[PDB]
């Protein structure tokens, strides 16, 4: 006058992306419904699973699964119920591996800009193992000249894969392209992104700030100023790079602070106190940075 034993011999077949076909066998007492759980190895709770029929008499021996995820591993087991209740559950089965499913969201953060002369760069967010979906897995980037109809693509594997710098000699300085992306995997391609506009390298400064003034206003403290950098057209520059650093010490080893629109100061904190400093200010963009300024000079006050 037990609870019934548990079934054994829990075997899978029918391995879908979704879905599985679980078998199992008995002995004495009658059983009224078999209930099912799964659990994802070999950290995971086992959880209740979806069957097709609905409810599995006891006379049944089979259940198809539904309502798995896809390139996932799972271990299943059953349990038997009858009047008296529930028994124990079954050993679990051996660990299976759901089929692929191709990718099912877009990369996120695309964008790109910069580079050497005659490069296209583009960036974006590599993607998780979550969202991955199977093995092999990639992306694919399509990017035209902004205006044209006709696209170039490029496929790179690796989920990691996090850039793409593409180059042509016959493509000029800060021309924007119409850029996209979509991952893949050994199954198929994902869903593409939405377009995004990205230039491609802009020419680096040619050009250093004329003069820099630089004043030391308190004991840690350097306030620094400077000519801007004319812009000729076609010239593009984001902001100034300034650099210090002590007297006798080497130019190499210099602090940097950047700056970013058309302000041509910057306050300079975390300094020594009576102490010289020299300072030099340089243009850049997102190709790098151009020439130096001749450099300046400042005390911080005692």
Same mark, same amino acid.
């Given at each position: 006058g037990s609870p019934p034993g548990p079934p054994g011999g829990v075997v899978v077949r029918d391995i879908g992306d979704t879905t599985v076909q679980l078998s199992w066998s008995r002995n004495h007492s009658p059983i009224a419904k078999y209930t099912l759980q799964a659990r994802t190895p070999p950290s995971g709770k086992w959880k209740q699973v979806r069957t097709n029929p609905v409810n599995i008499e006891g006379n049944a021996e089979t259940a198809q699964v539904l309502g798995l995820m896809p390139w996932m591993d799972y271990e299943f087991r059953v349990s038997a119920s009858n009047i008296l209740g529930t028994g124990e559950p079954s050993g679990p089965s051996s660990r299976i591996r759901t089929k692929e499913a191709v990718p099912s969201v877009a990369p996120s953060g695309l964008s790109g800009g910069g580079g050497a002369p005659g490069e296209l760069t583009i960036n974006w967010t590599p993607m998780s193992?979550?969202?991955?979906?199977?093995?092999g897995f990639g992306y694919l980037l399509s990017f035209r000249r902004q205006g044209s109809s006709s696209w170039q693509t490029a496929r790179v594997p690796g989920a990691d894969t996090q850039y793409f710098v593409y180059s042509n000699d016959s493509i000029h300085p800060y021309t924007p392209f119409e850029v996209k992306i979509r991952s893949y995997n050994r199954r198929g391609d994902g869903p593409e992104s939405l377009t995004a506009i990205v230039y491609s390298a802009e020419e680096e400064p040619?050009?250093?700030?004329a003069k820099v003034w630089a004043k030391g206003? #308190?004991? #840690?403290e350097m306030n620094v100023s400077w000519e801007p950098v004319l812009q000729d057209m076609n010239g593009i520059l984001l902001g100034y790079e300034i650099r210090y650093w002590k007297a006798g010490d080497k130019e190499a080893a210099a602090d940097r602070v950047r700056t970013a629109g058309l302000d041509s100061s910057a306050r300079v904190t975390g300094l020594y106190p009576n102490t010289k400093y020299h300072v030099t200010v340089r243009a850049y963009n997102r190709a790098g940075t151009g020439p130096a300024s001749p450099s300046a000079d400042a005390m911080t006050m005692k």
């Open positions: 193992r979550e969202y991955q979906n199977g093995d040619k050009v250093a700030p206003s #308190s004991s #840690s």
